[PDB]
């Protein structure tokens, strides 16, 4: 009881601190969310990563920071859950999580449609020579690079096989095709 009385006063102060972190994350999230959607410079996503893939990874980092305290909070005894102030903070946390998922769902949802469009680009890009001079260059859509790099990030954050299987074959053929094209243009 001696130390226990002091602990109750400490618990309300700790709950108040989590309120500031939740509000700070939310306020940061709203400013950050607008930049990510428009793919503006100095965006929240760290360094260089696929923009659609990066938004999901960025959402996860914000989500991880918000939920680290909740596991620790559930640890506290003496029915700190009953406290109305503790309940109010939990409601704020649930609202923030729901908004992040919807944004993630739009990105993944919109990305899903983009992936179907991207599949066609790999199928019908080929290698195109441009200008009067026959300077053959790989015409592999730059989008393909983002889609392939995009998939690897998704694995990190937790009938198309045959096409992906001849992904290895396509790379070998393009390198072989590129060498003859350079040789065939020099003579020309």
């Amino acid at each position: 009881p001696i130390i226990a009385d002091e602990l109750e006063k400490k618990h309300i102060v700790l709950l108040e601190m989590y309120k500031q972190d939740l509000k700070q994350v939310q306020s940061i999230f709203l400013e950050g969310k607008q930049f990510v959607d428009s793919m503006h410079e100095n965006a929240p996503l760290f360094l260089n990563m696929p923009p659609i893939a990066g938004a999901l990874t960025w959402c996860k980092s914000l989500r991880d920071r918000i939920q680290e305290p909740i596991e620790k909070l559930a640890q506290l005894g003496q029915g700190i859950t009953e406290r109305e102030e503790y309940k109010d903070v939990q409601k704020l946390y649930t609202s923030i999580t729901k908004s992040i998922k919807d944004y993630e769902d739009q990105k993944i949802l919109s990305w899903e449609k983009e992936v179907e469009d991207s599949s066609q680009d790999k199928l019908k890009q080929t290698l195109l020579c441009k200008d009067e001079n026959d300077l053959i260059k790989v015409n592999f859509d730059p989008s393909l690079v983002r889609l392939l790099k995009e998939v690897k990030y998704f694995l990190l954050l937790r009938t198309a096989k045959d096409i992906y299987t001849k992904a290895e074959t396509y790379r070998t053929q393009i390198v072989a095709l590129d060498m003859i094209v350079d040789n065939y243009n020099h003579i020309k």
Partner: protein
């Protein structure tokens, strides 16, 4: 000055002998936000004259990180955006003497 779009200073390094020269490498970490055929050069500044870089380092691709080497004076080694590794000499600058195989 007058670079196409803007180039972020991804990495900054200090001269090993003393703080008189700083080597800064410019590249865009944003994925696909870099303009096609954007300038990809590294400039080493001099504390005495900050109006323009004392020497210019030219690389095949933008160098994400460049750092000085204490063992050999005025030798700079950097990593390109493509993954190519290049080495430049601070005294002569210009093109990179050592370049790693791409594949």
């Amino acid at each position: 000055e007058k670079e196409i779009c803007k180039r972020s200073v991804s990495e900054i390094s200090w001269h090993p002998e003393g703080p008189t020269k700083v080597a800064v490498s410019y590249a865009i970490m944003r994925f696909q936000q870099m303009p096609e055929k954007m300038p990809t050069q590294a400039y080493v500044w001099d504390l005495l004259n900050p109006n323009s870089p004392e020497i210019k380092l030219m690389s095949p691709s933008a160098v994400t990180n460049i750092s000085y080497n204490q063992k050999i004076p005025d030798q700079i080694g950097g990593g390109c955006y493509n993954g190519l590794l290049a080495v430049w000499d601070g005294r002569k600058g210009e093109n990179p003497i050592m370049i790693s195989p791409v594949e």
